[model samples]
Target: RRRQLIRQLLERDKTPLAILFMAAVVGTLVGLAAVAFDKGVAWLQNQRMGALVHTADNYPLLLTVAFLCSAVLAMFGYFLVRKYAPEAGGSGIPEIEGALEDQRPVRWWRVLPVKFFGGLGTLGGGMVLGREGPTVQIGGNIGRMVLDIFRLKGDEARHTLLATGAAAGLAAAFNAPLAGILFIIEEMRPQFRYTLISIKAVFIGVIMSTIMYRIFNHEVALIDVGKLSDAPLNTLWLYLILGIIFGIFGPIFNKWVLGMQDLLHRVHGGNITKWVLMGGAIGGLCGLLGFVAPATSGGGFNLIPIATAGNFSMGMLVFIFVARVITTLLCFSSGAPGGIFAPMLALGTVLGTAFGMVAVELFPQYHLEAGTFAIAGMGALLAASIRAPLTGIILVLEMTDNYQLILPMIITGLGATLLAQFTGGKPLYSAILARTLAKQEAEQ
Candidate 1:
């Protein structure tokens, strides 16, 4: 390690080109894994939904069957985690974060299989969760897997590959290659050794993973909001106000999530059967609701477009919004192997739409479409929660294909992030990582 640093310092030219190529390979594999995982989860979910298409009208039977199916699947997920790998539970991003800090160990062998299969079961069972974070974690794990395979002898190689895989994984999962690359630069800046991040490698990995995701999920925007007008300068204040609202609530929301997780942990006492049953109950409930309300189930991505369309009244959107928030917290807090990002996006959009409606009613002259708020709001929660303002703004812009609203998105995201910091909100993933690291130390 000391010798490599000496070489890097002595001459930039001394850095081997092979390292760059290896990093690209890592990124490509990460992206491919992410895309394939997303499609596989989607496939499982669709298969389950397809079975209930006909008799779903019978509310009671639908509820019972859907609940049982989800419950069973969720339990299966918990079973894998408890019996095979407890590290697979919750969003795995924290583990990656911890690894970056060198405060936690990365058991790629256990994490890879457990997180992938376990995530498939809980997420596919209709729980309110996102695939992005887990995919990124998996991508990082795959990077280490490759390094392990090659029997790499240096800490630099291990760290670089792990980080590169994570970037590719995100690109693959969302099919947003640019966002994937930007994320490493922004979110991981503090931990990412700048000299070794290897931008070219990240590019290669993202490109490959993107190809893989497109092969399966087909290069579609995660949410289709159709298109909306740009926010006027006068209306920028409204976005700031929206950001403030998120800022104040973001930390509170994080607090509630941890509280809920602790509450559940105490209730189950970390017992395998009980944990499995509890997870199953939450998943099954989501499945049942999917059959009944439909709007309240699944990852919140699909609902963003529909909710933003302005077809539903503010009151109805509020109802759906509340239902999702509760379900999202429940499913995510129950030790399920999933993420909360997509659900939070849905939440932000709902809030933005609500604000838009109120604004339009007060000032009819503005003549704004609520859907525009949806675009801005899509990134607001990301700003407040993850505190990666630039990433939130860019990712939302890419996902919605509303390049015109980039300025407004930036303003809203910045506003949200600044407010969250003022309100003492820490980044969500980092907090989770701290918790995991503490546990890791104690166990050791």
Candidate 2:
């Protein structure tokens, strides 16, 4: 009966063509929005730094200015989310997932502006957060906004467009069109309807968004890690070890993330003032850390290539990984409007590099490249934590432009996923979504 009803509904809609067209429009618009958001964040960071350059000679003055600047910026973001769109806080990906299941409302008018600027404030403040989450959420909201404007009436149309916009946003963010498509298919498998027409819409949306992103940002790998040596079969076992390490840490990291979130929740108790102040304090600490150890704060994208290049010693790399793990937990858990993807990627790269370095020491004959492990380890954490191995693998492949390490990437991702599952680790986004739903249910 449900299948027949779906078929009847599909036939009654009879506007598959319009759905595809709107997908293109949604992708293009989201592409532009994502580019603007990226540029906006960069511009804010540059402006903040430019102001502080004058105080370079005065250490105390520089520290004071940095703290005040980042604190104010983060406070603004927290205030906006608390005062206007509460859904805009933290990584907006969970909200999108909930929206896909029709368990959460999509208030595009509020979320779009709030998230765009709110992300700029938080990310711009040097918080250890990523733009991908906000971009994905914005993309989904744009999809719904297009649907409302076109007055498209159908569950199929709604679901397809929302997924399309989200995929497009991800594609635009990382310049990884295939990863974006796979992300929707794999990461969102439960909520996404795998229909022929819907898949086509997703393709259209991703293509359009990629085109727009290329037009604005030019064609380039987002992470430009340079081609590294291949991982021979002899060295492949090391990848498994690295994967196992990440697999163990992934769950612990997720637990810490949730624990920190719960701690902050209790501290603030839904008080907007207290929440915003806490955000400011955390942001201020990030600002101070930015000067003390630049690699320990921010989204960590800039630090990835540096870390992978073997610039830091093993001790330094470990220090960075541990410091970032804490910062990532605090910034993400503090209800800041940002994503954990980039920070997690950085963490993986540092740990992978350190592991690779150690492997080289143990087996001097293998002549291993630490960078290869860095690439493989890049996705292992995502696979373990998010439980989307294909998306994680492809995403790393796209960003690094390294196809030769596919075997190691796959092996590491598999190992990580297996261990993560064995250890009873759940998908991070799903966990967050479930928590959101519970709160929503309680409120209702």
Candidate 3:
């Protein structure tokens, strides 16, 4: 029936105008969805935390309430994904990539609701996951939804709209229009069918989505660390060192994440009860951590500014980094409906700030600010792990509005990518897709 519908549409004249118009529509809808997702997560989180705050005077009660609230919330998310949409698990970006390649089906009907409400549960439960991934996945699904609704035909039209939605989703999420475009051009390059018409569709989609996002949330950089000093030529090498550090750690981090995922899968063994219970346990722990340490739990977006502002000592910074690393691995690997993007950025900021402080101590004459490294490091991990240096560089540049640090950002991204590649580390999303494909093959 679907094939017949497409064949009928193909018989009609295929015009670029229709796809472009559809792209705009997709972007507008995706923008609305992204804003709604952001607000929804925030509202849920506030309610959960607000209840805990109300009981703060009673320490034991506070802890118990926090645990139960987060556990139930996370369990709801985990249960929904396991029962309704397993593909909604983790960073839905891999699934999008797979869909772009026609290796995965886009069940928008199931995914949209599962990811949105499920994300509210996991992220609101204080899990260390990012909203960007879920937004991108939702955006892609909306694209497919529009395609199906309008009875659009041709593989090109299908491909163009999906890419447009994915890009628009990223743009809306971070309020970084250019980075969203580059994310598709770079990160989804292999899967994306880039052509003049398709590229234009992506541009139109991004523009509309960005406008929608601004209209609802106001225009502001997603991350605001304030403007910091530029990296002088003499001090440029420090960024390279920082990137190299992230380079070495990036592959290790990916390995740990993948390994943890496998371990968790074994623990759950495809049992819905076990899976949801495990999610509840992780969520409950995150809730307890949120009250006890605050920085070590949550998506870590709120932690970036505080970490960059020199609030914590070196020891404390390291501690938070290490602790969040554990929490990030646990929450994300548990198949919750969230992304690792924000958590990775937060980790990079923590590590970068520490590196900058050390650089300042070692070279007092450079007058270096740790915040500069924080910005550079923000993109370095992304470049290394995802192997999309252009997207990482532009993303950090756009988010921080620090164009003067472009050189450092580029150098850091390049260094990280080079080292990560040389160390035989695969791009994170591609690796995940490969795993998914292997599993599919096994099931067949």
Candidate 4:
């Protein structure tokens, strides 16, 4: 029935065939770019640690080298952003939002180069950031680049392709086609023009991107946690409680992010040298954390399984949670070329596991598994903080491949967003966009 309707709509729609071709092109390139970005980061990290393979016998020397190497690499990333494209810094999603709103410019040439290479530096240095931000920026820029090369200035084509590329980029990042489509429809909707938002183009882009992703990467879930047991209807309330907890924490986390941003601003005062040095220092500390307390560092993807598997004790989860909270703030707030999604996911997993542990002890008769809470909590913070509950739910559902827990997940997501709204917690991306717009206006 849906396909029938879609076919009917497509038949009536007068969209040029060229636009669909461009959308497919954008998806293919974005998927390839995402693959390359992942491999690039992996290669750099391997190279950084490969030489130290024998350093197991020389512990102190290994730590020293790790610090120095990561410091230099991260400093280079900061330099690329500050010297070339400052807009490429941070998540880069806000810049896309600004561009869509006409409040910011999208200089694809500079952004593509700076974000790709700089991401290699920061993310490869084991900074607490994700590749999704860079991939999305890359995808959006690729869309514009395609448009420029084709010299097509149609409003619908440009807007539709731009959104398509971003959707495709996200899909490529996590291999989550449905989630990608939902994100653009929900999170990026404010910037996405109504008439120009082509659902067919988004579907085409995601399909092509997912196809490309499978071609190179093979079929595998991004997250490899074993299948989690279903959440009983009676236990659904626990997820809501978890969501409320995140709702309270969401605003606090956003405030800390902005506060840290201000702190870094004051420390550097727009001086590129100071900013890079400080970033290097933070990166070095992350390197140290990677060696000593491995769970508290990096982008937090690897840590997710371990944390959710209940391998860590409650005390350990709390400790790592606090440490990562600080590290995530520092690495992301310092204007590094990375995304906070992975780190934030790790945080949510840790905290959720801790909560689940308590819940299990309280209701041992129910034989509640902490992993259930882990999955539910995984998307709750993003739901609350970003105020895109549907995106959060779908992204986590797609990434984890846990459809049986959808009811609990949706309950958690809605609860989080509701409480977050009640607590005056604005969406994190919108807040960041607001701050950027304020700066842009002030400069003008």
Clashes of each: 3, 0, 0, 0
Residues 1-444 of candidate 1: C-alpha lDDT, one tens digit per residue:
999999867875433566567776777677666766777787878877777765568767766777887888888888888888777788877777666656667788888888888888888888888887678778888888887887775666666677778778777766678887888778753453443556666677777778767776774567788867877777777777777888887887888787798999987898888888888889988988877787788887777887678877889788887898789889888878988877888888888888778877888887788888778888888888888888778788778898888877787788888888998888888877777667767998
Task: Tell me the deviation in Å of residue 328 in model 3.
Answer: 0.9
Query: Poorest 10 consecutive residues of model 3 by lDDT?
Result: 188-197
RMSD of each: 2.9, 2.8, 4.9, 3.2
Write the number of the candidate with greater TM-score, choosing between 3 and 4: 4
lDDT tens digits by residue: candidate 3, 1-444: 999999967865454788989999999999999999988888888898899889989999999999999999999999989999999999999998888888899999999999988998998888889888889999999999999999999887788898998999999988989999999887764554534337777999999999998988875555678888878999999989888988888898989889999899999898999999999999999988988999989988787887777787999889999998899999988889998876888888898899999988899999988888888888877888878889988887887888999998898888898899888888899999999999898998
- Residue 414 shift from truth in candidate 1, angstroms: 1.5
lDDT of each: 0.78, 0.87, 0.88, 0.86
Lowest-lDDT window of 10 residues in candidate 4?
188-197
lDDT per residue as tens, model 2, 1-444: 999999888776344788889989999999999999998988878877887897988989999888989999999999999999999998988888788788889999999999998999999999999878889999999999999988998888888899998899889888989999898888754544544337778989999988988988885556878988877788788888888888887888889888899998987999999999999999998988887888989888887897778888988998998888889999999889998876788888888898888887899889988888888888888988888899989999989988999999998998888889888898899999998889878998
In model 4, which runs have C-alpha deviations exceeding 4 angstroms? Answer: 1-14, 191-195
Point out where model 3 deviates above 4 Å: 1-15, 191-197, 219-221
Candidate 4 Cα deviation (angstroms), residue 238: 1.0
